[PDB]
Structure formats: structure tokens, C-alpha cells
Design a protein around this ligand. Structure first.
Ligand code: CL
Length: 199
């Protein structure tokens, strides 16, 4: 007999026990939305409330329901380094790979750009994500990891991980540039050396 919004309010309040209380109601529609198009699951993913997120996924919450800026719980978890939640999603739900973020990207591109190497590994191992996918700018995960970032150890490691998993480094973005082009222009010596070792 809960009113619409009860579960959103419990998620906003980070109230794990209240969430579980509500979910005991078998009639409850778990994917109600707020003014920004967020479901309780999306709120939990933003907050990194892992137990709440697991509870909602077990009750059938849609990991692919996008909010007003095109972020679904899945896309956001991948992009923003919510590793535990992402691992759970990859085991207990089915990602929709025809849904993209506001820039036309997937979960893997932003995970790499943002340095979330554990998320990258997860998506490469059991994600289905195309390593060569491109966003609206023509950027791949490799290009973003090289060209948009600082070229440091973390990004060197992300570049190596991608190449070891068969990333195509010959892909050009919308400006006609490859990952090798960016590393060279920016003076990212260690990345250039890594890239030179692969075809
Ligand atoms: Cl993207």
C-alpha cells in the first residue's frame, strides 16, 4: 500500500533497511522515477550503495533504464568505477548494448578515460562490449586513454591492458587521428613505446 516514491525516498536517504522493507512488498514497482529520470537503482549506483543496488537488481530493477542525461545504472557503474556493483550486474543482469551515454559511448570508453582499470578488466573479461566501439567523436577507449589524459603510469597500464586484449590501434577518430598520433604529439614516450610494440 506504499505510495509511489517510497522507494526513491528510501534510496535518497541511503536507508538500506527501509529499502529491503519496501522490497518485501511483491507488488511494488521498483523502477519508479524521479524528476531527473533516475530509478532507485540509479540513485544507489550514483551513491555507491552496494547492498541497496544488489537488493534492487535481485528484485528485477532494470539496469538499462536511462535517466535524463542518458545514464542507465549499467552505463554509470561502468563509467564511474563502481566495480562491485558492475561485477554484480555482469553476473545477475543483462546489459543492453544498444543503449549509449550522452556522448554516444558505452561503459568501456569512459571507464578507460577515467582510469578505472578494474572496470576495464571486468568489461573485457565478461562484458560483451566491443573493444573497438567509437563514441560521437570517433574516440575509442584506447584513444581516450591516450589522448584525453595525462600519460602517466595508470594510463600506460590501461593502454597495455587494451592492446593485450586486441584493441585496434589503427582506428582514426573524427579528426583523423590515431592513438599513436596523440601519444606522439603530447610527448607521451612510454605510451608511444608500448604502442610501437603492437601491430
Ligand atoms: Cl563516451
Amino acid at each position: 500500500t506504499y505510495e509511489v516514491g517510497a522507494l526513491l525516498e528510501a534510496a535518497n536517504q541511503r536507508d538500506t533497511k527501509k529499502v529491503k522493507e519496501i522490497l518485501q512488498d511483491t507488488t511494488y514497482q521498483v523502477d519508479e522515477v524521479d524528476t531527473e529520470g533516475n530509478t532507485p537503482l540509479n540513485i544507489a549506483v550514483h551513491n555507491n550503495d552496494i547492498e541497496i543496488a544488489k537488493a534492487l537488481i535481485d528484485r528485477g530493477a532494470d539496469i538499462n533504464l536511462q535517466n535524463s542525461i542518458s545514464d542507465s545504472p549499467y552505463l554509470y557503474a561502468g563509467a564511474q568505477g563502481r566495480t562491485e556493483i558492475l561485477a554484480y550486474m555482469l553476473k545477475h543482469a543483462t546489459p543492453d548494448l544498444n543503449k549509449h551515454n550522452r556522448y554516444g559511448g558505452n561503459a568501456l570508453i569512459p571507464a578507460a578515460e577515467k582510469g578505472h582499470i578494474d572496470n576495464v578488466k571486468l568489461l573485457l573479461e565478461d562484458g560483451r562490449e566491443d573493444i573497438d566501439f567509437q563514441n560521437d567523436f570517433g574516440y575509442t577507449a584506447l584513444i581516450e586513454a591516450v589522448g584525453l589524459r595525462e600519460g602517466n603510469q595508470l594510463y600506460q597500464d590501461i593502454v597495455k591492458l587494451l592492446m593485450e586484449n586486441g584493441a585496434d590501434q589503427s582506428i582514426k577518430d573524427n579528426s583523423g587521428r590515431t592513438a599513436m598520433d596523440y601519444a606522439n604529439q603530447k610527448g607521451y614516450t612510454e605510451i608511444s613505446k608500448i604502442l610501437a610494440q603492437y601491430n
